[PDB]
A paper describes a structure:
NopD, an effector protein from rhizobia involved in legume nodule symbiosis, exhibits deSUMOylation activity and, unexpectedly, also deubiquitination and deNeddylation activities. Structural predictions indicate that the 1017 residue full-length protein of the Bradyrhizobium NopD symbiotic effector consists of a long N-terminal extension, which based on the Alphafold-2 model is formed by a combination of disordered regions and small helical globular domains, followed by a globular C-terminal protease domain with homology with the CE clan of cysteine proteases. The active site catalytic triad seems already formed in the absence of SUMO or ubiquitin substrate, as inferred by the distances between the catalytic triad residues (Cys971, His916 and Asp936) between our complex structures with the AlphaFold-2 model, suggesting that NopD might be active in the absence of a UbL substrate, as initially observed in human SENP233, and does not require any substrate-induced activation mechanism. So, it seems that rhizobia NopD has evolved to gain deconjugation activities for SUMO, ubiquitin, and Nedd8, in a single catalytic domain by the acquisition of a “Loop insert” sequence and the maintenance of key “hot spots” in the interface that are essential for the proteolytic activity of each UbL.
We have elucidated the molecular mechanism underlying this deconjugation activity by solving the crystal structures of NopD in complex with either Arabidopsis SUMO2 or ubiquitin at 1.5 or 1.9 Å resolution, respectively. The final electron density maps show the covalent bond formed between the SUMO or ubiquitin C-terminal glycine and the NopD active site Cys971, confirming the specificity of the catalytic reaction between NopD with SUMO2-PA or ubiquitin-PA substrates. Several conserved contacts are observed despite the low-identity of the C-terminal tails of AtSUMO2 (-MLHQTGG) and ubiquitin (-VLRLRGG). Gln89 in AtSUMO2 forms a hydrogen bond with Gln873, not present in the equivalent Leu73 in ubiquitin. In vitro assays with the NopD Q873N point mutant confirms the role of this hydrogen bond for AtSUMO2, and partially for ubiquitin or AtNedd8. A previous study reported that NopD was specific for plant SUMO isoforms, such as AtSUMO1 and AtSUMO2, GmSUMO (soy bean), PvSUMO (common bean), all containing a similar C-terminal sequence (-MLHQTGG), in contrast to the lack of activity for human SUMO isoforms, which contain different C-terminal sequences (-YQEQTGG in hSUMO1 or -FQQQTGG in hSUMO2/3). The structure of the AtSUMO2-NopD complex sheds light into the SUMO ortholog specificity in plants by the contacts established by Leu87 and His88 with NopD. In particular by the electrostatic interaction of AtSUMO2 His88 with NopD Asp839, which cannot be established by the equivalent Glu or Gln in the human counterparts, and by the hydrophobic interaction of AtSUMO2 Leu87 with the “Loop insert” pocket.
Residue numbers in the entry:
A (entry chain A): 829 to 1011
B (entry chain D): 15 to 91
The structure:
């Protein structure tokens, strides 16, 4: 989908980049791809639905049982109000490797903003919420780019077995994202 | 020739439809948004973990009677 230079990202932009990333990972590292879930932002919201059957359907679609890593773009859009379509994006990485100590790392470029939703999603994925560091946004429109570039940097670190997932040094590129979406 | 489908909203609301398997899902989507008084362009429909396109038909997606389509409002941030 078309994305402008300062346009707020919609779920369609996040989903499209996650589709490209999933295909890129499948080709370059199929063993990591098989163990990783790039969750559609709409499905991530379904996971926190007040409707139990909606949340469970979404859980089945994610199939977290056979995954070591879940990447969830977290929108703050309303579940019950048609007019409140969201203000902010953040990123939840669920590390399921220790099948007894699941950790949900919450990366928010406005520290604290989405923590309540992150906690609800972490609980529904049987994981303990941990705030994780990410470079803080210096404008009010790039949170979605932090989510996407943060995901891509985390995937590189996981593929490389790097121990430190601190994203305080993250470099964002809206232009490169726009290039990917337009390809 | 006919198939019964449920559209399930994010708040749990349900609407039931009966349509021909050769017909584009556009007709069901248009009718759901019309009935819900929401803009078609503000809603996404998901099935088997994927976003549905209005031009796809149930036969194209192997939908069987009783299948559920999840309707979600688009997000921005």
């Amino acid at each position: 989908p078309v994305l402008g230079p300062t346009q707020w990202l919609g779920d369609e932009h996040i989903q499209r980049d996650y589709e490209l990333l999933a295909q890129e990972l499948q080709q370059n590292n199929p063993d990591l791809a098989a163990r990783t879930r790039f969750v559609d932002p709409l499905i991530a919201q379904m996971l926190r639905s007040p409707s139990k059957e909606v949340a469970e359907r979404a859980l089945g679609w994610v199939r977290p049982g056979t995954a070591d890593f879940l990447f969830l773009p977290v929108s703050d859009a309303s579940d019950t109000d048609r007019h409140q379509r969201g203000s902010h994006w953040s990123l939840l990485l669920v590390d399921r490797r220790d099948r007894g100590r699941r950790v949900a790392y919450h990366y928010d470029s406005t520290q604290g903003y989405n923590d309540g939703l992150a906690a609800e999603l972490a609980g529904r994925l049987d994981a303990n919420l941990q705030q994780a560091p990410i470079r803080q946004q210096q404008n009010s429109y790039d949170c979605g780019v932090f989510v996407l570039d943060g995901t891509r940097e985390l995937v590189r670190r996981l593929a490389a077995r790097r121990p430190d997932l601190n994203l305080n040094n993250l470099v964002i590129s809206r232009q490169e994202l726009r290039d990917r979406l337009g390809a | 020739a006919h198939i019964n489908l449920k559209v399930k909203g994010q708040d749990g609301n349900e609407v039931f439809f009966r349509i021909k398997r050769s017909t584009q899902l556009k007709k069901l989507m248009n009718a759901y948004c019309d009935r819900q008084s929401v803009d078609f362009n503000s809603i996404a429909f998901l099935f088997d973990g994927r976003r549905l396109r209005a031009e796809q038909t149930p036969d194209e997606l192997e939908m069987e009677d009783g299948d559920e389509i999840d309707a979600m409002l688009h997000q921005t941030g």
